[PDB]
Design a protein around this nucleic acid. Structure first.
Ligand SMILES: CN(C)[C@@H]1C(=O)C(C(N)=O)=C(O)[C@@]2(O)C(=O)C3=C(O)c4c(O)c(NC(=O)CN5CCCC5)cc(F)c4C[C@H]3C[C@@H]12
Ligand SMILES: CN(C)[C@@H]1C(=O)C(C(N)=O)=C(O)[C@@]2(O)C(=O)C3=C(O)c4c(O)c(NC(=O)CN5CCCC5)cc(F)c4C[C@H]3C[C@@H]12
Ligand SMILES: [Mg+2]
Ligand SMILES: [Mg+2]
Ligand SMILES: [Mg+2]
Ligand SMILES: [Mg+2]
Ligand SMILES: [Mg+2]
Ligand SMILES: [Mg+2]
Ligand SMILES: [Mg+2]
Ligand SMILES: [Mg+2]
Ligand SMILES: [Mg+2]
Ligand SMILES: [Mg+2]
Ligand SMILES: [Mg+2]
Ligand SMILES: [Mg+2]
Ligand SMILES: [Mg+2]
Ligand SMILES: [Mg+2]
Ligand SMILES: [Mg+2]
Ligand SMILES: [Mg+2]
Ligand SMILES: [Mg+2]
Ligand SMILES: [Mg+2]
Ligand SMILES: [Mg+2]
Ligand SMILES: [Mg+2]
Ligand SMILES: [Mg+2]
Ligand SMILES: [Mg+2]
Ligand SMILES: [Mg+2]
Ligand SMILES: [Mg+2]
Ligand SMILES: [Zn+2]
Lengths: 38, 142, 211
RNA sequence: GAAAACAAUCCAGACCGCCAGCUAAGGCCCCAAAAUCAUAGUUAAGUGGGAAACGAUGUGGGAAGGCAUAGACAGCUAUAGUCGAGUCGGCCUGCGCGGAAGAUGUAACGGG
RNA sequence: GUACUCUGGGGAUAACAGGCUGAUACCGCCCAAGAGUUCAUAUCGACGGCGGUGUUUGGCACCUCGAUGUCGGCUCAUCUCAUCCUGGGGCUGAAGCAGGUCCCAAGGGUAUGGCUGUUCGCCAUUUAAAGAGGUACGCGAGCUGGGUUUAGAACGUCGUGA
RNA sequence: GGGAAGCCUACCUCAAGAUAAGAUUUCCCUAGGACUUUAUGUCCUCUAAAGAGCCGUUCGAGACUAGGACGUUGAUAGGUU
């Protein structure tokens, strides 16, 4: 997981979601693309 | 002179019973404090206690809005170093609803001997039963 | 849990067949006489009240005389309660006795007593404070407290600061002790290790709650 | 008098007395005088009641575009086939969200 | 010239500590040319940009000069978390054993000696670990007085000399 | 739904001055007159119990206190054996 103020999609397998008011990015292809914050 | 203050010996204290089920805590507490201080009577005197006795039943059913059930926190401090004790409304309403009502009405009553005298007239019980059937309280909704 | 009240009689040793020396304390038990049974209906909690020892008539007040007469047992030198559950109350009635056979060899028990009083003591003995230099220019400060706080912030002494004061003479419980012998004929329990208090003091033996 | 407390801020310039009335700044649920006042909306963050570059299908309101039931988009079958109306990608604009770690004790609405 | 010194005065005006500020210091973020055998973003990251703390060197002279007496050591502490060990997790250029980086977590614990007055620092040998800070750079009406800053004397240097 | 040496319980000690002053067992006191400001009123005469303290011999309790035991129906302390 990458915790960082700026979160963006890296590839076509990335998805932006909101959970309990927190912005996260989940990747089906690359686990290293998982992000949380901002 | 011509403006007369109420005499404590001549004051009459009635008894009322209130159900707290499905009511907002603060908007109930304002009326409770008003009636305890006696502002509703035309013989109101700031230095005399002219209120009435208020019994509160079903105290654990009191409600709060928003996310306050989880977010409203209650604090106290033991005078030992680093002794800060901290709790939540959800747990406090399950444990000691009387503390909930006591804090809510104390915050609104005056801070002094007269306020301490006034707060003693509020009786809070978790269940729907109270031990003051001898006083023949009348039903009051507020 | 249900327990026994006894008197500390002194320390000794027991030798095993292999020759190991086991230190032990002896507890003399005058069998406990039940005085009152408390219940949820009358008292709101479940306890068993017992008395032990003897007291001469001139030292028993009329109220205690009536209390003893209600249960029909002789007055003792003390009265103590044990909190109990529903199962323990079975077989227990006013006027009954608890001797010594309540315990068995090898059972782990807790022993509670009153510790020896050391009077008014200082930091070195009460709190294990360290002394300052005996030489090298130290004037009159060997066993003194030292610094007791910070500067103008906070400007006070924090409550609970360790200082000189009375030490000892308090209730103390020791856990994890083992029953080495249960002498019914002499009505004594021999337990391994040491227990609080001086010879002749009153002690309480209970089944261990950490097991 | 008001801004909790607060010379330099806002209102206002105290000759004395009154248990009379109207107003200024600021206010009207309780501490504490006065609306739990009336009609339209917005916010869900206790935002209100500290805050930056930057980040985001949060939620409203606007002026315009591509495509489309001679069948639009997303799913499924090997550019076609069954589903059966809205669907896409941008520009403004109101209120909200992360960015947000400190030392005695809640301690960033005076409190409830 | 005065450290052999003296009187009248000033926090109208310096040295310590407190206060305002945050250039400096420390920490956290934004962009991503490149380094990573290919791949910016496992680990780093050029040129530039935005913040936080009050932990450094500083700026100002608001309190104290009819006095707020201490560099280090000793004794005794209390708090913060930007976490040293122990506890729970994501990613990995994570086979295992061990690592790297990030998130949560402050309950407890978190060395003895040689040298110097040292705070530090280097060294020897241990430990699971020998954390970073605030509290008048905690603590001297609780102790010491080695450094430093009176009065004696000597060397190097400066001055004709004091 | 799961989920940490972290939070509340859990282990030990204190705790109803908790003025909200709580609960249980047992024990004790069951007499007459006068007056007036008509009241849990004031005075006298008669009675004072259940207990507590003073005092003493003392302690493994202790600065002084407090606390524990005992005081002839006695082993509390000293002596004696
Ligand atoms: C004394 N009275 C007037 C107030 C009062 O009464 C209360 C109170 N609680 O009572 C108080 O908050 C105050 O006293 C106070 O001190 C405040 C602030 O700090 C402050 C601030 O700092 C910045 N931001 C910056 O200046 C940034 N700089 C400027 C450019 C870049 C650097 C902006 C800002 F609006 C404020 C508000 C004041 C208010 C003030
Ligand atoms: C409600 N209570 C808590 C206060 C209160 O009672 C009063 C009052 N008058 O009574 C009020 O002033 C307040 O409500 C308030 O609103 C304040 C501010 O503005 C403010 C501020 O802005 C900045 N700094 C900046 O903004 C700019 N920085 C540049 C980089 C990023 C941000 C710094 C700062 F300390 C403050 C103080 C607050 C105080 C607050
Ligand atoms: Mg003693
Ligand atoms: Mg000596
Ligand atoms: Mg001396
Ligand atoms: Mg000496
Ligand atoms: Mg202000
Ligand atoms: Mg304000
Ligand atoms: Mg004022
Ligand atoms: Mg005038
Ligand atoms: Mg008017
Ligand atoms: Mg009002
Ligand atoms: Mg706020
Ligand atoms: Mg502001
Ligand atoms: Mg002078
Ligand atoms: Mg000045
Ligand atoms: Mg300074
Ligand atoms: Mg100062
Ligand atoms: Mg400075
Ligand atoms: Mg000036
Ligand atoms: Mg002075
Ligand atoms: Mg210091
Ligand atoms: Mg001092
Ligand atoms: Mg010296
Ligand atoms: Mg000379
Ligand atoms: Mg002899
Ligand atoms: Zn991806």
């Amino acid at each position: 997981m990458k915790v960082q103020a700026s979160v963006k999609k890296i590839c076509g397998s990335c998805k932006v979601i909101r959970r309990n008011g927190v912005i996260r990015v989940i990747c089906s292809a690359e686990p290293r693309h998982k992000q949380r914050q901002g | 002179m011509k403006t007369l203050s109420a005499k404590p010996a001549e004051v009459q204290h009635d008894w009322f019973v209130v159900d707290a089920t499905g009511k907002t805590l603060g908007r109930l507490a304002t009326e409770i404090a008003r009636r305890l201080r006696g502002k509703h009577k035309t013989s109101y005197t700031p230095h005399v206690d002219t209120g009435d006795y208020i019994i509160v039943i079903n105290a654990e059913q009191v409600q709060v809005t928003g996310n306050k059930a989880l977010d409203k926190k209650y604090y106290r401090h033991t005078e030992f170093p680093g002794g800060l004790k901290e709790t939540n409304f959800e747990k406090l309403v399950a444990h000691k609803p009387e503390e909930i009502f006591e804090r809510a009405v104390k915050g609104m009553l005056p801070k002094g001997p007269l306020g301490y005298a006034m707060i003693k007239k509020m009786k809070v019980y978790a269940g729907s039963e109270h031990p003051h059937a001898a006083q023949q309280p009348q039903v009051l909704d507020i | 849990a249900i327990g026994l009240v006894g008197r500390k009689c002194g320390m000794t040793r027991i030798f095993t067949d292999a020759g190991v020396s086991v230190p032990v304390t002896v507890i003399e038990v005058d069998p406990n006489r039940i005085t009152q049974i408390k219940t949820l209906e009358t008292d709101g909690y479940q306890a068993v009240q017992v008395t032990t020892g003897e007291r001469r008539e001139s030292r028993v007040t009329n109220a205690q005389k009536g209390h003893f007469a209600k249960a029909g047992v002789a007055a003792g030198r003390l009265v103590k309660e044990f909190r109990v559950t529903e199962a323990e109350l079975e077989g227990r009635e006013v006027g009954g006795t608890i001797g010594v056979d309540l315990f068995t060899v090898g059972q782990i028990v807790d022993v509670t007593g009153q510790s020896k009083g050391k009077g008014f003591q200082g930091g070195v003995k009460r709190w294990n404070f360290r002394t300052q230099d005996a030489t090298h220019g130290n004037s009159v400060s060997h066993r003194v407290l030292g610094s007791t706080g910070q500067n103008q912030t906070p400007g006070r002494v924090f409550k609970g600061k360790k200082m000189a004061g009375h030490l000892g003479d308090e209730r103390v419980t020791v856990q994890g002790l083992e029953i080495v012998s249960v002498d019914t004929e002499r009505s004594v329990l021999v337990v391994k290790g040491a227990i609080p208090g001086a010879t002749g003091g009153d002690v309480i033996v209970r089944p261990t709650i950490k097991a």
